[PDB]
Short mmCIF file of C-alpha atoms in Angstrom, two decimals:
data_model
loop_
_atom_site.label_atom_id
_atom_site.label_comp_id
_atom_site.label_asym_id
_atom_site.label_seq_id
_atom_site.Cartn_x
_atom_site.Cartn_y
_atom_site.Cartn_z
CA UNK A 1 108.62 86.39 168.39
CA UNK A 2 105.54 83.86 169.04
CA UNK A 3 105.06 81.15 166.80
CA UNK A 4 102.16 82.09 165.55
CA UNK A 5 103.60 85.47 163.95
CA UNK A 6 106.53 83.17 162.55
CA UNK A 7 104.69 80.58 161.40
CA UNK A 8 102.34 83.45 159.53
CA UNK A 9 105.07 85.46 158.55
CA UNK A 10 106.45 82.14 156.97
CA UNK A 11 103.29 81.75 154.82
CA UNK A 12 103.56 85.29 153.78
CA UNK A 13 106.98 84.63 152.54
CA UNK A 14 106.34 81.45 150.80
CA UNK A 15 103.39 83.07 149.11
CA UNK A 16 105.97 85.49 147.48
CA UNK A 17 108.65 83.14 146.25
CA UNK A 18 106.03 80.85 144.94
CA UNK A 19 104.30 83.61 142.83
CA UNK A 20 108.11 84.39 141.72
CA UNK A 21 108.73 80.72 141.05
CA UNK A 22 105.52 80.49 139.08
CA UNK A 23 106.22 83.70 136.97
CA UNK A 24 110.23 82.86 136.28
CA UNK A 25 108.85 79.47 134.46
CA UNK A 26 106.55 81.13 132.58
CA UNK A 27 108.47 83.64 131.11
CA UNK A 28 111.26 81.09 129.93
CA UNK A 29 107.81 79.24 128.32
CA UNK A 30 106.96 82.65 126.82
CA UNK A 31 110.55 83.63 125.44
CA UNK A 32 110.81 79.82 124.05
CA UNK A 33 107.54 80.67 121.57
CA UNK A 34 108.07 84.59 120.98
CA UNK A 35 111.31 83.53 119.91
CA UNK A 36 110.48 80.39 118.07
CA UNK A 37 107.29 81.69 116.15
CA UNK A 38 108.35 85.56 116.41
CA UNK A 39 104.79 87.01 116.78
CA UNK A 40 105.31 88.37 120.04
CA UNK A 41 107.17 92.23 121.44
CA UNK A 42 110.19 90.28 121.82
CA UNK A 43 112.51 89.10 119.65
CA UNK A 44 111.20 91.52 116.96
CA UNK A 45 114.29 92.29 114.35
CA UNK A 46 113.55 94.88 112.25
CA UNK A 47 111.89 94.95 108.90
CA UNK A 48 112.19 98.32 106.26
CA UNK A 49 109.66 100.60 106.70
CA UNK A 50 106.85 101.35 104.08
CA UNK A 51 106.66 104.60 104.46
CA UNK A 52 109.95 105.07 102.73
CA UNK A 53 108.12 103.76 99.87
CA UNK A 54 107.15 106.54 96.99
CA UNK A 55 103.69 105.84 94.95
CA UNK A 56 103.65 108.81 92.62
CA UNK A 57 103.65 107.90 89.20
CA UNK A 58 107.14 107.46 87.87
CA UNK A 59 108.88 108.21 84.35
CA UNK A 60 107.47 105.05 82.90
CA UNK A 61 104.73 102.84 83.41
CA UNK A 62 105.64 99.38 84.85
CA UNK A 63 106.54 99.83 88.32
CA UNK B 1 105.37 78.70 87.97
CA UNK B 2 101.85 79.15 85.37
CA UNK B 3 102.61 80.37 81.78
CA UNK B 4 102.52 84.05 80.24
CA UNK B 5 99.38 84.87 78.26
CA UNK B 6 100.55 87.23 75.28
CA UNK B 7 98.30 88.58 72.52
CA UNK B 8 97.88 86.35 69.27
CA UNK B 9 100.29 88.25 66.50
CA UNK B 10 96.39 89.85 64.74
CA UNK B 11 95.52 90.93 68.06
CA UNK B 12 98.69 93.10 67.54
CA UNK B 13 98.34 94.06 63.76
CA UNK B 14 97.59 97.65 63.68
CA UNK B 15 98.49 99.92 60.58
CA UNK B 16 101.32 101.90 62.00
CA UNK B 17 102.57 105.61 61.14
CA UNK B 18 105.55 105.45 58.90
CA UNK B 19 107.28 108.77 58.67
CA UNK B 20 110.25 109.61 60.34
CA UNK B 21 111.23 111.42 63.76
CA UNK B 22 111.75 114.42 62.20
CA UNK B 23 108.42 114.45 60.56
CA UNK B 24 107.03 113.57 64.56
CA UNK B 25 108.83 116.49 65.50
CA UNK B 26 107.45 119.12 62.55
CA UNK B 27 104.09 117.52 63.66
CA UNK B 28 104.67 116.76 67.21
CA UNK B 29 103.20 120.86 69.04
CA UNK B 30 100.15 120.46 66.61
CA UNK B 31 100.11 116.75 67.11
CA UNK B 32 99.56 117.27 70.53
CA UNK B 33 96.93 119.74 70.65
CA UNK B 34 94.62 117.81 68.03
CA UNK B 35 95.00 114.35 69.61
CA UNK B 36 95.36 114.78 73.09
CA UNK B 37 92.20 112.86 73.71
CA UNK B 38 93.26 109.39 72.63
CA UNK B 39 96.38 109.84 73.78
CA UNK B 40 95.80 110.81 77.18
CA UNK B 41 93.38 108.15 77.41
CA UNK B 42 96.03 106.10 76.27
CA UNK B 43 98.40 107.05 78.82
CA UNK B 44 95.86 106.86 81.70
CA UNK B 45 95.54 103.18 81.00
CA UNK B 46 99.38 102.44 80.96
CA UNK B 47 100.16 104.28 84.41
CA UNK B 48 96.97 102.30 85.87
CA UNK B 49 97.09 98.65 84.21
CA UNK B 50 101.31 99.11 84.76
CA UNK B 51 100.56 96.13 81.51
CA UNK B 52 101.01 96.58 77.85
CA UNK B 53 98.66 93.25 77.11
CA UNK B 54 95.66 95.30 79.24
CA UNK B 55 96.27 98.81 76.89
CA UNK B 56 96.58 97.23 73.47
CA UNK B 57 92.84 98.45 71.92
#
């Protein structure tokens, strides 16, 4: 192979790995506050669900 | 964690019907044809305030 097409195909590759790099940093960043502050998709534990919830008027009056 | 408001004791006095449940009952399929109005009015307000201190009048 020339150098040229090494060198080249070198930048290519280092182009990749840094865009990797760059994204595996931020996503520890990103779990650290969705995890912290839990107001992200992740880390989302389950709360009951409303629906279950019945509003017709029951046998007495205070509830 | 703030106090309860309740009704003075006079905002409560009311003359009250003093005959027994078996006099209710005798009373109680004509009772409820002749004073439905009131009453249901009466019940409205309870299921929507869900407060006895908001239903008193």
């Amino acid at each position: 192979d020339g150098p040229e097409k090494n060198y080249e195909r070198t930048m290519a590759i280092l182009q990749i790995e840094a865009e990797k790099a760059e994204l595996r940093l931020k996503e520890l960043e990103v779990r650290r506050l969705m995890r912290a502050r839990g107001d992200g998709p992740w880390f989302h534990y389950p709360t009951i669900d409303k629906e279950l919830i019945d509003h017709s008027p029951k046998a007495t009056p205070d509830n | 964690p703030g106090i309860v408001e309740l009704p003075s004791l006079e905002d409560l006095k009311v003359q009250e019907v003093k005959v027994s449940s078996s006099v209710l009952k005798a009373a109680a399929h004509h009772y409820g044809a002749q004073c439905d109005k009131p009453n249901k009015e009466f019940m409205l307000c309870r299921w929507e305030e869900k407060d006895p201190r908001r239903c008193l009048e």
